[PDB]
Enzyme design. Structure first.
Site, PDB file in Angstrom:
ATOM      1  CG  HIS A 118      -1.737  -1.045   1.536  1.00 21.41           C
ATOM      2  ND1 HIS A 118      -1.303  -2.159   2.213  1.00 21.41           N
ATOM      3  CD2 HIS A 118      -3.048  -1.287   1.248  1.00 21.41           C
ATOM      4  CE1 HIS A 118      -2.309  -3.020   2.307  1.00 21.41           C
ATOM      5  NE2 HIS A 118      -3.414  -2.535   1.724  1.00 21.41           N
ATOM      6  CG  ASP A 158       1.793  -1.055   3.597  1.00 27.56           C
ATOM      7  OD1 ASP A 158       1.138  -0.818   4.628  1.00 27.56           O
ATOM      8  OD2 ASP A 158       1.407  -1.881   2.738  1.00 27.56           O
ATOM      9  CG  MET A 195      -1.179  -6.146  -6.608  1.00 31.87           C
ATOM     10  SD  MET A 195      -1.274  -5.495  -4.904  1.00 31.87           S
ATOM     11  CE  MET A 195      -1.490  -6.996  -3.945  1.00 31.87           C
ATOM     12  CD  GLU A 201      -8.229  -8.347  -1.282  1.00 37.26           C
ATOM     13  OE1 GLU A 201      -7.325  -7.571  -1.647  1.00 37.26           O
ATOM     14  OE2 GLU A 201      -8.064  -9.116  -0.317  1.00 37.26           O
ATOM     15  CE  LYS A 228     -12.340  -8.925   5.615  1.00 35.55           C
ATOM     16  NZ  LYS A 228     -11.431  -8.044   6.369  1.00 35.55           N
ATOM     17  CD  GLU A 275      -7.592 -12.272   2.025  1.00 33.29           C
ATOM     18  OE1 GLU A 275      -7.000 -11.305   1.541  1.00 33.29           O
ATOM     19  OE2 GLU A 275      -7.892 -12.339   3.226  1.00 33.29           O
ATOM     20  CG  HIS A 301     -11.619 -11.714   2.001  1.00 38.01           C
ATOM     21  ND1 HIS A 301     -11.152 -10.598   1.330  1.00 38.01           N
ATOM     22  CD2 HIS A 301     -10.921 -11.731   3.174  1.00 38.01           C
ATOM     23  CE1 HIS A 301     -10.240  -9.951   2.064  1.00 38.01           C
ATOM     24  NE2 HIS A 301     -10.099 -10.640   3.186  1.00 38.01           N
ATOM     25  CG  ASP A 346      -4.777 -11.110  -1.747  1.00 38.88           C
ATOM     26  OD1 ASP A 346      -3.947 -10.955  -2.645  1.00 38.88           O
ATOM     27  OD2 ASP A 346      -5.211 -10.130  -1.064  1.00 38.88           O
ATOM     28  CG  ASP A 388     -10.867 -10.458   8.305  1.00 36.59           C
ATOM     29  OD1 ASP A 388     -10.044  -9.772   7.652  1.00 36.59           O
ATOM     30  OD2 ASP A 388     -11.576 -10.054   9.244  1.00 36.59           O
ATOM     31  CG  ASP A 446      -6.097 -12.043   6.896  1.00 32.65           C
ATOM     32  OD1 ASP A 446      -7.138 -12.548   6.349  1.00 32.65           O
ATOM     33  OD2 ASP A 446      -5.821 -10.830   6.752  1.00 32.65           O
ATOM     34  CG  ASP A 471      -3.736  -9.945   2.395  1.00 36.82           C
ATOM     35  OD1 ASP A 471      -3.075  -9.639   3.432  1.00 36.82           O
ATOM     36  OD2 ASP A 471      -4.705  -9.279   2.020  1.00 36.82           O
TER      37      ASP A 471
HETATM   38  O1  LIG Z   1      -9.018  -8.004   4.698  1.00 37.82           O
HETATM   39  C1  LIG Z   1      -8.569  -7.292   3.808  1.00 37.82           C
HETATM   40  C2  LIG Z   1      -7.826  -7.426   2.497  1.00 37.82           C
HETATM   41  O2  LIG Z   1      -7.443  -8.757   2.286  1.00 37.82           O
HETATM   42  C3  LIG Z   1      -6.627  -6.496   2.251  1.00 37.82           C
HETATM   43  O3  LIG Z   1      -5.279  -6.883   2.732  1.00 37.82           O
HETATM   44  C4  LIG Z   1      -6.391  -6.291   0.744  1.00 37.82           C
HETATM   45  O4  LIG Z   1      -5.839  -7.464   0.247  1.00 37.82           O
HETATM   46  C5  LIG Z   1      -5.255  -5.286   0.463  1.00 37.82           C
HETATM   47  O5  LIG Z   1      -5.455  -4.195   1.385  1.00 37.82           O
HETATM   48  C6  LIG Z   1      -5.648  -4.833  -0.977  1.00 37.82           C
HETATM   49  O6  LIG Z   1      -4.510  -4.560  -1.817  1.00 37.82           O
HETATM   50 NI    NI Z   2      -6.362  -9.513   0.695  1.00 41.70          NI
HETATM   51 NI    NI Z   3      -8.577 -11.428   5.055  1.00 44.74          NI
HETATM   52 NI    NI Z   4      -8.289 -10.096   3.757  1.00 44.43          NI
END
Ligand SMILES: O=C[C@H](O)[C@@H](O)[C@H](O)[C@H](O)CO
Ligand code: NI
Ligand code: NI
Ligand code: NI
Ligand SMILES: O=C[C@H](O)[C@@H](O)[C@H](O)[C@H](O)CO
Ligand SMILES: O=C[C@H](O)[C@@H](O)[C@H](O)[C@H](O)CO
Ligand SMILES: O=C[C@H](O)[C@@H](O)[C@H](O)[C@H](O)CO
Ligand code: NI
Ligand code: NI
Ligand code: NI
Ligand code: NI
Ligand code: NI
Ligand code: NI
Ligand code: NI
Ligand code: NI
Ligand code: NI
Lengths: 388, 388, 388, 388
Positions: free
Chosen positions: C54, C57, C88, C181, C183, C217, C220, C245, C255, C257, C287
């Site tokens: 990001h 980041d 990316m 993406e 979610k 993802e 998600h 992801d 979530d 992860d 991710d």
């Molecule tokens: O839960 C949230 C997402 O997975 C997040 O990490 C996205 O992947 C990233 O912010 C987009 O680039």
């Molecule tokens: Ni993600």
């Molecule tokens: Ni997630």
């Molecule tokens: Ni996520």
């Protein structure tokens, strides 16, 4: 490597599992009915230890006493011919329309009395066939709407029912114990005693709690998104794991009753690790449904697969626990310290111990990593047979 | 019609609720911190009865004994100025990194001893402020992976901790009781004692079970898809509903802690019906988070809304129960029969009663409708204020 | 057998993954921040192919243009020193309080314009670093309550935003594509475009749909209880799987992860089988969040484990597909027939074909078993390395 | 206040709803079958506008052409006698064992051809009875295991089927449109096109997309924990809401098909608000099951309740939107700004606008509260009829 079950492995199956005809809420049967005698013979050939039944699986509802005798004698001869045992039996209090609002907690008092009599008749049969455990699954005890069921009154009725059954068994001198099977929903919108915890708590309010334990089912706790191995650990801790139903479930949805090892595979691994390391010595019973896509060859393949997957996971969990690298990782993650008492020195010494508070270095303690991810990847490597 | 709370309604709020700054896993705080004194004054103006706290909400972690005294004296003056009470207190065993693997069931023994000392220090403060109930929420007790935590050892450690706390309270002569708050997950992947049932079952294994009850939270049981009113009925039945946390939740997902009445509205209705009809006399505590979209005006609006929605539902449930048409519908659905014993005549008379089995007309019984849908639509009409 | 990744395997990680400090809704950070340069160096040593970021980041929010330059130059030197790529990039439109009601669909118009400018600034940076895919995760686009967000207006605003970004990229002549993406929830109570299907459908309404795909993802889709491999198959079928992801999730809850291969292990197997058999050639991006129980050694172990588990599953899926016994089982289950057109003869011939209806023997067809359980147990045996 | 439906309200019911006999996975039927003619007469008396059917609800599977004629003529006379309409029809591709692996995506090619012919025969009947919408619910399209179904091939077969049906309707010159009904699971472990989004996305790949829309069902999206009003808004936005199925569902579990207004009551409120404010002019169809606890009096009460609850919610949503205090709250929450374009000035002006980035005061913007909680409590007060 092979994975051949023998009767010593104590694998058991309900008649209603391999005998499921494939009727679901949206579809007709895809398979013909199986004669119980045929199921006992085929299961014995696969290496099973025994079978279980509901009253109505063995003796058609409404049978005359003369036909009842006939059905039992045929079944007993199949058991004698194969060496199969009957370690558990249970009552069908859910299929007939009279049980549409429950058996033991139906609002209609006459139905509750009938439910008790139907149950008592089958306990006598269960003892004659040598069963050690009598399961109760209250699948119709519950509600779709809030006003339909006062749950405190319903729990009074449930307790009254189990206390009467305990009086019966004790007055008859029977050596049989009861196991309550929780389920959170399906077929009622919410079922009473929905999880292992609710069942354990209820038992402690019975008049003779020592006669009652739990029969947890993998997919049932998973229908509430709970961790099945954790719930089994609590039942073991309480001394109440009298029986167990094994199958698979993919998450929170209708109860699928897949073969054991399907659904959540890692949960199946930690479950077998725990049963074998705790020394659980009861039956490994499969309460599953061969999918209605299958013909009878697929039914027997699905049943064999239940047992195969248990035996593969048993081998992998044993290898995990015996691996010196894993034993070192467990010490690195302080599992040894978890097993030591927090304060065997007692309250007063704890209160006087400056290292427990006044002079405890919280920052140093907080900086220590738990090393759980390395431990979990060793577990994964063992499960997949990828150790090097 | 208005719906004005008064201190007699026993509505209480944690400092951490209206004081939540809006930090979530993906975002920074959206609101400044609130001084506890300010929260007590604003809540008293809204009609609340009292407030609750964690040790670390009132006294900043690591405070010197001299600053500790200062913070308590200011708080006490705000209580004296407003007439607000402190019926419950609890310990923060979850925010500091040292508790990353738990407090009472951390694998590291020194952390477990620290957790106990931190708790004991705050029980003394709670008694001084007049609290009657001490809540324990073991939010870090649990695991993300199967090997990290032997749950039987963890339950031994949990029991050892609660037994020590019971010894402390009794040796000090304190009139305070403990309430365990279950939650199934979040922040750990699975938390120990995940539901009201698991907590009730665990209590029965403590050395002095009479000192311990449950503090169930609406959204927590709903995170496992369970029926909150049913779980509360089981706790009441057991005599163990010592405290309750009210909020709202939309289904199985992260715990949202919406204001009470949001989330599952019909469940909120049946919950209020049950608390009021059972005579629950403890605090009606709101453990909720004003959404981080809101400024302080929205915080106070959200808090007021908690109390308003309780009072609207209380009025609607009372009207439902008092309606002669509903009383007739309850008899039509045989709720009166559910309250009568199944077999007060006893086992032997039940076994001898031919009308309970030999001569029971199952088809006639099965044909009787339960009339639950008409009953549920009367309940709906009362909830929506649509009676005519 | 070993399972060593190389840059050719295209494994990539976000800076924010191994850099997650362990802050959760109930707890403080357990780890110090990582310098991006340090993460790039450690990931390259583990065998990763590249990193993602990001804007915030890499460049601290509010940085001066002179500090921005400094941060990019240091990062670029770390990429040059290690051979790591940046395939990316994405925008943080979720952490700062200004995005509390969304970026592209915030009710406040000035916030929406800011969100677009912040995004455009980072696309230019992404192209300079060589990124091919620009991800958008609308984590704050959504609502906790029904009146707060008119979803048709919000979808208009979302489309307007993506159409403007498409105009920008095309007018600048950039070779970059967007990936949305989805979610379903968290941090908002419901998020817009909650699943792969909703995102795919929305793309077809954009002005230049060819510029936009999905970045699904694992966890998600599993937070909505959906089958991730199925959703990926639909994205592949549509030609829209631009990025993916990878991580793990245990069911319907917050979530988690977890590292890839944790959570639903069998789903991970069928996912790898599908990516490899479809020839997916994009990055395999993780991710994930190393649990906050871990120190930095556990962070790197968790990251290594992501890649290891992919490579074990890749080997097992390939062995499954290459096994002659499995190829015969697939024919027995008629997967070959599924790939053949139903009616390449055309409508009119189908209507004239008496064997398709008038003379179709439905009972014979219905009696054929699908042999799916034998096929699934071969898949299980391959996954566990139990073939004989 | 009363809430009497009239045919102008366009309430419709499937024959299979009030005709459900109460068979569930664990229980026998509790009610006798209803003659379709009887259902049409009783529904007309309750104020319904029309009825819907599957082919096999009206004409028993395997009927001779002569019995087919007889069944249709009787039905048509009941429609003529009552003024009831038939706005929608559909095919049963799920009950007969031949459809155990699907209709359009069964692995066996001969089954797929049969499924198409069975469907075509019933479209002709639907047009004769005046239906405007033809629904397809692919309840058996899916899988219990990963290897059983290649989903890309299955989507090819699904597209081939719908494209053939579109060719048929157009070559015959029929004025009928198709509506695909998504469901995530049950009876298959995962069903293809599991949500409204996946169905919308698939339609865009058909040869004549304008002929196809969606028929979303309240409980189906809620079985994946999704927000039904949000999904309906996306369908409206796309121009694809051709039909809708109304019922109630309590969370993520088996599909309950409760009467409309049961289950998630606040979701029902926001759904009615959206249908009425968007001007949805199609049927309000109830796809529900009277619980098997009920006799026929409870069936008709449950059906009446569907319509009553819609009309109460319609009144409350209209009062909400017309309230000047709510209109002011919507402006306070900037819903008016959400409806304004973000950048009608265009890309270049946005890039040149210093107030959108260089000189945007992020802190001032972030401090503005959204006032969503006050808005949501006005919505709650309107729903409960508590305005003062
Ligand atoms: O839960 C949230 C997402 O997975 C997040 O990490 C996205 O992947 C990233 O912010 C987009 O680039
Ligand atoms: Ni993600
Ligand atoms: Ni997630
Ligand atoms: Ni996520
Ligand atoms: O879903 C239901 C239960 O699992 C059921 O099969 C019980 O196990 C059996 O009826 C009790 O003995
Ligand atoms: O999600 C967490 C809990 O609800 C928490 O707020 C407890 O209620 C409080 O910490 C215990 O006293
Ligand atoms: O759960 C299943 C569906 O809701 C089903 O009733 C469809 O609506 C109908 O069969 C399609 O026309
Ligand atoms: Ni079961
Ligand atoms: Ni089950
Ligand atoms: Ni079972
Ligand atoms: Ni909580
Ligand atoms: Ni909570
Ligand atoms: Ni709480
Ligand atoms: Ni449905
Ligand atoms: Ni449904
Ligand atoms: Ni439907």
């Amino acid at each position: 490597m092979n994975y051949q079950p023998t009767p010593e492995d104590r694998f058991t199956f309900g008649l209603w599992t391999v005998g499921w005809q494939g009727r679901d809420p949206f579809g007709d049967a895809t398979r013909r009915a199986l004669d119980p005698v045929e199921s006992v013979r085929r299961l014995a050939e696969l290496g099973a230890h025994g079978v279980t039944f509901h009253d109505d699986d063995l003796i058609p509802f409404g049978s005359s006493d003369s036909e009842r005798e006939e059905h039992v004698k045929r079944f007993r001869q199949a058991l004698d011919d194969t060496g199969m045992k009957v370690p558990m039996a249970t009552t069908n209090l859910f299929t007939h329309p009279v049980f549409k609002d429950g058996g033991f907690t139906a609002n209609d008092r006459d139905v509750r009395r009938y439910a008790l009599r139907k149950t008592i008749r089958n306990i006598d049969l269960a003892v004659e066939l040598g069963a050690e455990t009598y399961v109760a699954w209250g699948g119709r005890e519950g509600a779709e709407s809030g006003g339909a069921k006062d749950v405190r009154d319903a729990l009074d009725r449930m307790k009254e029912a189990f206390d009467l059954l305990g009086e019966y068994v004790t007055s008859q001198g029977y050596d049989i114990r009861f196991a309550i099977e929780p389920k959170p929903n399906e077929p009622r919108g919410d079922i009473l005693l929905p999880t292992v915890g609710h069942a354990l708590a209820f038992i402690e309010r019975l008049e003779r709690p020592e006669l009652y334990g739990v029969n947890p089912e993998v997919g049932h706790e998973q229908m509430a998104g709970l961790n099945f191995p954790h719930g089994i650990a609590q039942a073991l801790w309480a001394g109440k794991l009298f029986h167990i139903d094994l199958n698979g479930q993919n998450g929170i949805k209708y109860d699928q009753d897949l073969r054991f090892g399907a659904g959540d595979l890692r949960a199946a691994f930690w479950l077998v690790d725990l049963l074998e390391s705790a020394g659980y010595s009861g039956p490994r019973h499969f309460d599953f449904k061969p999918p209605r896509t299958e013909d009878f060859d697929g039914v027997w393949a699905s049943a064999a697969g239940c047992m195969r997957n248990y035996l593969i996971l048993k081998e992998r969990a044993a290898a995990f626990r015996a691996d010196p690298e894993v034993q070192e990782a467990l010490r690195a993650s302080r599992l040894d310290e978890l097993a030591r008492p927090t304060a065997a020195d007692g309250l007063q010494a704890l209160l006087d111990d400056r290292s427990a508070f006044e002079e405890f270095d919280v920052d140093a303690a907080a900086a220590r990593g738990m090393a759980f991810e390395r431990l979990d990847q060793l577990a994964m490597d063992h499960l997949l047979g990828a150790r090097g």
